[PDB]
């Protein structure tokens, strides 16, 4: 896996709280980042995973953690899904559009025969190193709580290196 | 250009009049087909080109012509857009989703740096031969009327070899 | 397609209003251009398409739009065809000869089997970018009227960038 | 990642309750399996993750789930570690030895510059398909209860497809 | 040079006395053929070479020789030229159009710089073998009568195999 | 074979008398060294070869010869093995851990299909040159006295070149 | 064909009226040269072509033209032949020996099958440009007088640049 | 090392008790073999190693062990060294000549810049598998006794596989 | 060198006693052959070497040894040189012409700079194996006497294999 | 053949009149050299070729010619053979050992399947140019007299360019 490797440069358009912005790796430098990948906007499954993360967003920002959800849809589609779904509407973090599939391929998370990203979550530290990876098949939910636990644990480890036992 | 070449095999999902279906080159054999490519669903450009083709869909079905609109979005996104835009709601032809971009690259119509298709239209005869091609930059609309004209002329020619 | 790409350098001989001139990409820089390819001079096909463009040439020149018809025939052949056909004689725009096929191939418009160019039209802006492409099989006609509308729309968006939908 | 791909064939020796057995992919067919990778036996870090999984092994087995812990150490070393650690002693599932690193590389889980496996867990279904993947850096712990939840969800979805919450 | 090699197959359209026809290598088998290449139709240069050949045409046809003029122009353009030029209208032999340049290239006679054939004449016997070659720069003329001499001698040497001194 | 070639650079962890130290080729410069490779710690075969070398370690040290036993196990495992085997307990020289198999491959001594080192001994002189090589299949023992003889011969020849018996 | 290209450099030995000399491309610069290739010395075929050229030699030398006969035989063999054959002894121009086949190959005139040059004549102007080419199969003759015509016209066209019709 | 690999096919001439014979791998099948490599015949160092082996030859034949000494010299040289040196004279085993260096290269025992083999000894079982390897620099003697010990140990192991301890 | 290799197939024209014949490797099979290469006919060098071979030809034929002189000159040139030189006229063996250089290259004996063959002699046995090679720079002469001794020795060992030293 | 080409650089050990020395192409510069290759020392073929060259060594040293015999054996073997064969004992020129075969391959004279050199002699002038080459199969002896003759002629030619 990509565990313990440095993220790659990227440049994508995103939808964030009613506005379109540009996100690059420069924007992640010096902060804790979560790249949350999912297959596609507007499908028939409920966005509970994305919603669960939105429910814990405020707490994640306290920890200084930025969140970026990613799918191969465009940021335009994201804006429309954001105003058509009650759950998605709760999202205040950036929703990156990756139509070229480059961000998704950077994380080796592309299903090439579908052109859609897999259900993968990556935790990245301030130096751009992946400290936690979680991948799941459809129906096996990614728990935002366990995600918070891992991040706190990863932040703890960075402050207290070599934790003897 | 691809003028006068045979279209390639393809298998994509699509939204058509409320239902999701599969489309392949096999569904085009024996028919006149129009492949209408555009950049993306839900942007801020007026969907007049798509709606205009819809206004003429009635007439095209009479000439035995099928219409397939194509973008790199999913069929799911087409369904959503079809319920959001009054102009898109008029569409009764198949809206093909090409998330992998394979259908788009078949017609050598991909902007690789954007992951979206260029505004291209192709007219294909019953034998899979591209008989007319039209491509324009954004802001320069495609006229549905001119399309119908080209299609009738294309049909004449096939039944009245060289005059 | 070649949509949104810059035209490539070229150098050909042409017939324009009784004389032989040389055209290069230099002449198109800073101007709007229409490259109108066709298969061949002196064929039994009605020159209706070329004359049709001639009919709109005055308005095109008024709009800063140059026109260049192109075929793999020589510029010598164009002179003859021009003083031979009532329709072709109406043409005041340059008639480029492309016997090496280079100009035609720059636009990826060659029917390699016949050594003749396909029936394609290209609209190029002052910076050399292709903004509109049209290609048709023999017998399917190009409407000069449609070309005019497109050219105007092209000029419009160059002047009014990112005009969102009202 | 390896999500949704089929596990590759393998043949390793392991230590299972005072015994040395062989384990191959055939042993996993028609069963639910958890492949638990860790870097090394006998190190200073508390074998917390290994023990937590040991505690929930009763439950896992009730669910028809087999567990295999894996490291590049040999089975001989696992047997020794199992005799000296109170925590490791409570392990009743198979402890696979992967000295050639073939098993580890099959799951693309090798830290090449160390010759040790990364902290990664893989849930594999009866047809050998990887349904869940978890990888963490040293210090970040893997929660066995979170694993149990995922396993039950994977079984539920296998048994009842499409019963996924409908949108609006 | 191509001297003493067999001509390559070809298929071209041509103009021959009011009508359009198709010439192919098969139309040369068992016959003496002369391929006369020239740069271009409707030029400002005197059509002398082609005309001086039309004159000796009855004679040539008698010796069992066929004449094929070749240019990279189309056959449509040939018809037109054999109607606006007095000298050209005297041509009873086939005027081949070679817009793809294949026939010219078969004879290695293309001026790649211009997409026009060079001033070259070839003599091909019934077996498809080139027995005489003549290439001239624009300006020097190709003597029609001398061509006839070559054909006579070529025709003799063919009848009375290498006659020692 | 690697006879008469210079040893390659290396950096490994080892267990030396209750401690964990690092060992690199720099540690061997200006010294005589014996690199003793074996397949695995904690296995069933009697650690005879390892102990025999342990017994003669006093003598070896009197001669200015350092000993390094090597296996693809980790140093952590060597420390554990050193605490449970009476024979291994008498080892006072460094026990190098080579989990990435880099040291082992430097001496071209890896059984690739097992990820374990072959039974091979290498005598390296002060300038890092390999002067003697010995490799045996499992079951065929390496004699520490035969090793001592070779080492003394290697030192004698280094000190007195050409003093080799004259022919007739 | 090589029509209208610049001759390539070369260095060869040759026989010219009782003595041996060295001809090189430099000896052609600023001069009109005729390269006359023939298969082989001491053959059983009439040396007519070479002899018919010797006759017009005074004339040619007057028009500022140099003549070089070329064969893959050595120059030693040329001296010998210009002593046992009456026709050959009339030659005042340089007889070049081309045993390596380089000169023949420069002019793409080698019959690789036999290691002998084909019957070809080339006209090169002072700038080293080939203006006329003639290749003939063994048997057909190369008209010496016609060669002269070509030279005259070639020489004219060079003086009075392309004179339109 | 080559430990535990199968020897490669070979075919060399050898000198054995006054006679020249041919040795191939077929000759080793079903028996225990010792390939004793050394740099060169007639040097100034004493052949004690080869002599020590000769002293233990009889005992090695009892164990069913064949011995083949090898150097890149020819078998002719071997015959002469055998009758010039008292020590070599004691040798009753085969002395293989390997002038092409193939046997030596088969065992990866060549010093390429010298064209001489290294001081390497290989013990090969009846199935052609190398069970013991010993390599030594000049002056560090190979002890025939330790060699006998290893062979007996290897023969024991083959009769009593998996010797528990 | 080519020592102990089999000659390669070949096909050339030669002049032999007033006529033109064709020689191939077929003619050498079953016989002993001497291929005597030299640089050129009609040169100012004394033909002493070729005539020297002529002088021993009768004894060579008596021994079953054919001889072939070879140069890149044509067989036509050989005829002339033969009826022109008192020395060359003594030759009754075939004089091969190798203008393509193929025969000469088969024996790796070409001076690529001059297009002429080097002064080399090759002795070929009935099975096509080269048993003796001799090459010299211009001016260093080949002794026909030495060639004869070698040929005899060659024939001797073919008849008496592995003759150890007395 | 290698006729008229320049010899290549080489460094070999040799036995010469009781002593071991090193020989390189540098030792040949400015002198006439004879490289005499043969298969192997100690075989059963009469060493007449080598002894014959020895008989003429005296005379060759006068013409300023060095002689180097070469085989793929070591210099050690040459020393031994020089003490065993009465014919070889007459040799006062350098006997080069070419165990790696590099000197032999330089003169493209190796029988690769045997690891021995073919019976070849090469005459090299002061500038390293091979002026005469002679190769024969076993049983067909090389005549030392003919060699001397070739060498004198070679020397004449170098001082009397083309005659």
UniProtKB/Swiss-Prot annotation, chains A, E, G, H:
Chain's gene name = ahpC
Keyword Oxidoreductase in record = yes
NCBIfam families assigned to the protein according to its UniProt record, in alphabetical order:
AhpC
Protein name as catalogued: Alkyl hydroperoxide reductase C
Tell me one Pfam family matched here.
AhpC-TSA
Q: Which GO terms describe its biological process?
A: cell redox homeostasis; hydrogen peroxide catabolic process; response to oxidative stress
Q: What lineage is this protein's organism placed in?
A: Bacteria, Pseudomonadati, Pseudomonadota, Gammaproteobacteria, Enterobacterales
Q: Which reaction does it catalyse?
A: a hydroperoxide + NADH + H(+) = an alcohol + NAD(+) + H2O
Q: Which organism is it from?
A: Salmonella typhimurium (strain LT2 / SGSC1412 / ATCC 700720)
Domain of life the protein comes from: Bacteria
Q: What class of enzyme is it?
A: oxidoreductase
* Enzyme Commission code: 1.11.1.26
Molecular-function GO terms, alphabetical: NADH-dependent peroxiredoxin activity; thioredoxin peroxidase activity
Stretches of the chain forming a coiled coil according to its record: none
